[PDB]
Amino acid sequence: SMSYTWTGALITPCAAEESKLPINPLSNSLLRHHNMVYATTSRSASLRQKKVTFDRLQVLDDHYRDVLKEMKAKASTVKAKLLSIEEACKLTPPHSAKSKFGYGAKDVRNLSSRAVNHIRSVWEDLLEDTETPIDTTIMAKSEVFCVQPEKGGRKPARLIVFPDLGVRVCEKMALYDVVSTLPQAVMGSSYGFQYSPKQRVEFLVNTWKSKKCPMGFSYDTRCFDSTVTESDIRVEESIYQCCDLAPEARQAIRSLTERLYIGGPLTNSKGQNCGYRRCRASGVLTTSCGNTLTCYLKATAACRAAKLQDCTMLVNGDDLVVICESAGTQEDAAALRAFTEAMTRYSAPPGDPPQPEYDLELITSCSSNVSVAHDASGKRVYYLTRDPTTPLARAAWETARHTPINSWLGNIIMYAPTLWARMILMTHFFSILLAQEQLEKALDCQIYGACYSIEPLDLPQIIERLHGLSAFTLHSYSPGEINRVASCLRKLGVPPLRTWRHRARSVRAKLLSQGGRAATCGRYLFNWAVRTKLKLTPIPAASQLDLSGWFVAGYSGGEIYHSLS
């Protein structure tokens, strides 16, 4: 069964695609090697198509089936509520794709008579048609990367697939509660999305220390979505069906599974037939939960085949980390081969093969690795961090162009404690914000496929809740970490880490100068940039935050918008 089949209709853009970074002043202040920062366009989509299109063989064994039965037994404890139309409408992001039926996302959120009526009619249809494949749009995704180690050697665009806005509101009705609460229920400590960065590094470390003589490894899969088989999607459904569901909810899931999730026609932006899909659609609500479930099922089966001892997993969609138990160096390298050849039977061959690590800090996952620093107390605090090449690169983009999602905002949130988000991302953007009278404005950002609307003035307490107060006091960062950031600041052409210190003093003074919530940003965020430190006490607004539904579930192209209605 082919992941995709094509007709020859192109993957068309719906608008004008920008490919290169503008030489903006605000841009160049951050990053001067602007010819290194590109964005993806539909021009590279056929390259991608060649990567994602293959025939997939799949052979399930007793291990797989044991594990599946164990997951279903736990999913049987779940009682999932059916959402009301209004409820699912509220969950729709305001700048989500308009419906081909002359109503939009802002219409849905407003309960526009028209939108609501043909959401209803779509729901009705899901109950009375169990067979007809639902149409989908296929699109080249525009993302900014920095170029790489070879020649100018760029990633092709990712392909997104999504049904109509109406179906997407329906998916939410039938399945939001299921995909929000079943992953934790089935996978427990291993479901990665339940974790704020603090909690995530805490789990990783505690898992590590709990071991004998720990061995760990990431496992990258080649184009995961393309490997998800029709079987995979049906089995996924068999798990959902173990929930207590409402009768309509149950037929809705059964219909969506047959009509949408397992495959269907792909249409371009010109309304032409592009071809057929028989694997995971990136942009349906089940994509994150289903990927996580499927990954954790396959991984856990492959462990037992590989005979790895006392494994623990952290699964985030298709990103898999495994901390387990060394049996000797050559033995370990041999079981890691087995895990792979077993994953390959399950139709999940590896990107570049898994490599046993023996330092926790060496293992990468979710584009991330644990690192160590010290708080003001000299006490060693663990934190999570990554190569800043991509974040800074996109930071360079959102500076020079208006973008719907400001990744930097999310990046300062998730990577509050990191050297590079503190010295560059915080400094850069706050000097901009201050020089533009735009601190009180709220900007949209994503955390785990979920959109929030946040005012940057509330960044210190959001950072304290998630990361701790030490994330304003960290120093003595590790050598290699420091050496990676600096090495990256060269590549991108970013002023080095001593440059950013002065700029910070300047804005920090400009921030204190304003009192109110502004000043507490300057005092807390940029306290690193002085030696006569102010001293830092718990912020009153910290505990009074509603950070519910923040680190509960992942919604990768699930179209979720948790912020205020």
Side-chain angles (χ1 to χ4, degrees):
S1 62
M2 299 307 297
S3 55
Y4 294 94
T5 69
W6 310 102
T7 69
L10 316 156
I11 299 174
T12 47
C14 47
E17 301 172 296
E18 211 177 306
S19 66
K20 290 180 223 185
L21 192 52
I23 196 169
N24 199 246
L26 300 172
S27 136
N28 216 83
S29 46
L30 188 69
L31 176 152
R32 108 190 153 184
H33 285 97
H34 50 58
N35 276 7
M36 302 211 67
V37 168
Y38 72 102
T40 37
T41 79
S42 65
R43 291 188 278 285
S44 65
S46 82
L47 278 185
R48 175 56 58 162
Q49 292 166 248
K50 174 183 167 184
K51 281 175 189 281
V52 307
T53 295
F54 51 89
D55 181 73
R56 17 199 186 74
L57 302 182
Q58 192 189 32
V59 181
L60 305 171
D61 61 17
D62 277 339
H63 279 318
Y64 181 83
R65 280 180 289 262
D66 294 347
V67 170
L68 176 52
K69 289 188 195 178
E70 280 154 22
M71 300 168 73
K72 296 180 69 170
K74 252 161 159 52
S76 295
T77 48
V78 185
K79 172 175 188 184
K81 337 290 191 90
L82 183 63
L83 257 51
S84 70
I85 306 191
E86 197 190 324
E87 279 187 278
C89 283
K90 299 196 245 253
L91 289 173
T92 305
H95 293 107
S96 174
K98 58 152 164 270
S99 179
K100 80 183 52 183
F101 301 106
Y103 64 85
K106 234 128 165 158
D107 290 314
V108 167
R109 304 188 44 81
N110 281 343
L111 314 177
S112 148
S113 153
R114 150 164 321 193
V116 154
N117 285 346
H118 288 75
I119 282 173
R120 243 163 240 157
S121 92
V122 170
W123 183 260
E124 297 308 319
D125 186 270
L126 269 173
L127 308 181
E128 328 203 31
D129 184 326
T130 62
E131 269 145 350
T132 302
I134 297 167
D135 189 45
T136 71
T137 307
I138 174 167
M139 277 295 182
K141 193 201 207 150
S142 197
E143 295 176 303
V144 171
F145 306 109
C146 168
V147 303
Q148 321 236 81
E150 33 167 353
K151 96 167 183 80
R154 326 173 156 202
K155 301 177 182 285
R158 291 181 234 261
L159 301 188
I160 59 171
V161 184
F162 60 87
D164 192 86
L165 164 56
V167 192
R168 290 192 327 245
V169 184
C170 285
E171 290 181 80
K172 277 195 199 57
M173 283 187 294
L175 272 148
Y176 173 75
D177 198 31
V178 168
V179 301
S180 296
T181 54
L182 182 130
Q184 219 279 338
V186 177
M187 287 174 298
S189 76
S190 293
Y191 184 52
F193 289 110
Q194 57 176 306
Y195 296 131
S196 68
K198 148 188 143 189
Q199 292 166 345
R200 177 172 182 93
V201 76
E202 173 180 17
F203 177 78
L204 278 175
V205 162
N206 294 347
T207 286
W208 191 266
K209 303 298 183 184
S210 66
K211 303 305 194 194
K212 183 178 179 180
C213 178
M215 186 280 279
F217 69 94
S218 51
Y219 184 82
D220 160 68
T221 312
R222 291 165 194 169
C223 292
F224 188 91
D225 283 351
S226 293
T227 71
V228 181
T229 61
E230 302 175 9
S231 181
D232 287 343
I233 309 202
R234 292 199 157 96
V235 172
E236 187 182 325
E237 183 212 356
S238 82
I239 302 173
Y240 304 147
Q241 293 284 333
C242 294
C243 297
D244 188 273
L245 302 157
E248 290 189 5
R250 200 186 281 286
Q251 177 65 66
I253 289 153
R254 176 88 281 277
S255 283
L256 290 152
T257 286
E258 279 302 312
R259 296 180 56 188
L260 183 43
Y261 297 152
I262 60 167
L266 296 169
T267 301
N268 61 16
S269 83
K270 286 188 168 169
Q272 298 162 316
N273 186 40
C274 283
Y276 211 76
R277 164 183 58 83
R278 294 176 184 278
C279 54
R280 178 92 59 204
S282 65
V284 289
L285 187 58
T286 45
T287 297
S288 177
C289 164
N291 280 342
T292 310
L293 281 181
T294 288
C295 196
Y296 169 91
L297 162 56
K298 284 174 182 195
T300 297
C303 283
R304 310 186 178 175
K307 289 167 171 180
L308 295 174
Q309 295 100 350
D310 203 342
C311 300
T312 302
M313 296 198 188
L314 208 52
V315 184
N316 299 78
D318 79 314
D319 203 288
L320 161 74
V321 128
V322 179
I323 293 175
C324 79
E325 269 203 17
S326 198
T329 287
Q330 42 294 320
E331 279 92 343
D332 276 356
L336 193 31
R337 257 192 310 276
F339 176 102
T340 298
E341 62 179 299
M343 284 284 285
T344 304
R345 289 191 304 277
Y346 298 144
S347 156
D352 61 310
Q355 310 293 59
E357 300 290 343
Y358 294 91
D359 191 332
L360 170 78
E361 315 178 33
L362 281 203
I363 297 172
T364 315
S365 63
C366 270
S367 315
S368 298
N369 71 281
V370 183
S371 194
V372 201
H374 296 66
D375 61 5
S377 325
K379 171 196 186 189
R380 330 173 316 154
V381 180
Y382 288 116
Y383 71 105
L384 197 63
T385 205
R386 59 173 290 152
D387 190 310
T389 300
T390 305
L392 288 172
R394 293 176 183 173
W397 189 273
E398 301 155 339
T399 321
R401 287 227 88 65
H402 310 291
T403 47
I405 300 289
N406 303 265
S407 74
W408 65 270
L409 183 52
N411 262 331
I412 280 168
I413 301 174
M414 285 286 277
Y415 290 113
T418 80
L419 178 87
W420 48 270
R422 297 180 68 204
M423 301 202 68
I424 298 157
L425 279 180
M426 279 174 193
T427 303
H428 171 74
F429 284 103
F430 261 90
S431 274
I432 296 179
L433 280 197
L434 217 168
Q436 278 178 355
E437 305 268 354
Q438 273 172 4
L439 294 167
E440 294 177 350
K441 189 173 194 183
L443 290 177
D444 298 342
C445 67
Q446 279 197 337
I447 303 293
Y448 295 159
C451 188
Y452 306 92
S453 171
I454 295 188
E455 307 167 9
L457 285 173
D458 292 325
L459 267 166
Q461 63 263 65
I462 296 188
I463 279 176
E464 188 185 356
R465 281 285 289 264
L466 275 61
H467 288 288
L469 268 186
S470 41
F472 302 124
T473 88
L474 293 188
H475 55 81
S476 309
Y477 294 94
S478 82
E481 169 74 359
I482 293 168
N483 270 351
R484 171 164 65 172
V485 166
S487 190
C488 166
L489 301 180
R490 285 198 279 299
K491 192 179 59 177
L492 285 172
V494 180
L497 289 177
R498 337 310 321 161
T499 293
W500 290 107
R501 158 140 218 193
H502 199 242
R503 294 182 182 175
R505 290 173 76 90
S506 184
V507 51
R508 174 183 176 285
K510 280 204 181 82
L511 270 182
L512 290 166
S513 145
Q514 292 199 6
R517 273 181 320 154
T520 189
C521 301
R523 174 191 272 248
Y524 285 88
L525 293 176
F526 302 102
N527 189 252
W528 51 270
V530 298
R531 266 126 201 60
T532 88
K533 327 272 185 191
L534 285 185
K535 259 58 187 147
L536 308 167
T537 75
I539 304 176
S543 36
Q544 305 306 327
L545 285 170
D546 201 319
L547 301 186
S548 64
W550 263 53
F551 301 90
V552 175
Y555 316 92
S556 142
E559 294 302 340
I560 299 301
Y561 182 89
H562 274 173
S563 191
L564 164 140
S565 310

